[PDB]
Amino acid sequence: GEELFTGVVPILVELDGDVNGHKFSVSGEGEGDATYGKLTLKFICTTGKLPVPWPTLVTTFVQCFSRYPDHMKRHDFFKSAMPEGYVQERTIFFKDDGNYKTRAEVKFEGDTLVNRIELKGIDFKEDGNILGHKLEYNYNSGNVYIMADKQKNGIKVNFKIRHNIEDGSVQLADHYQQNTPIGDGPVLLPDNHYLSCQSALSKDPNEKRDHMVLLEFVTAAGI
Ligand SMILES: [Mg+2]
Ligand SMILES: [Mg+2]
Secondary structure, eight states, rough: OOOGGSSSSEEEEEEEEEEEEEEEEEEEEEEGGGGGEEEEEEEEEETTTTTTTTTGGGGTGGGSSOOOGGGGGOOHHHHHTTTTEEEEEEEEETTSEEEEEEEEEEEEEEEEEEEEEEEEEEEEOOOOOOOOOOOSSOOOOOOOEEEGGGGTTTEEEEEEEEEETTOOOEEEEEEEEEEEEESSSSSOOOSEEEEEEEEEOOOOOOOOOOEEEEEEEEEEEOO
16 A cells, blocks of 8 residues: 555545534545655635634544654555555543544545544533633644554554643643554554654635644654
């Protein structure tokens, strides 16, 4: 699958979400260049206003675009599953608040890498940092720890994201994730390692719909 990633690849993201009963959808488009661990995308809420803050959705919205150094290429599960793809499931625990459960399918459609997601959020507090919209339009992430899951011919991944609250405080989002191949073909099952990421959220000055522009860089390491 690595060969599929040598140049710039278009990406499409489609998400249907329901958080405490608030339903919404988001469409995103952009491109990824795995040689540089780089992605650029613009997301738009197609049903109106997003009911949760945009930064809470970044991680849900394509780790196959991570740059794996030559010496670690044999640990790159993500690209090895393509084009058939993989299912990525998560539970994201917002400290002292609700949780998101997501299921996505990541695969190629033609020359485009597609990430289709279903998200369900429950137990959020009506006036917590999420539904109350008290988060700043940014975040800080920890290392993304990856390990093999032989039993499922996949990987297990865990990490934390620290959301910044408007009052100067922090809201932790603990991520638990599993990825399993869609195809029956061989995949790379890796030794333990981690991804290091950074991103920048911005707005399209000329855009009136609720949206987010994202620039993100990710590199594998720890080997
Ligand atoms: Mg802070
Ligand atoms: Mg080994």
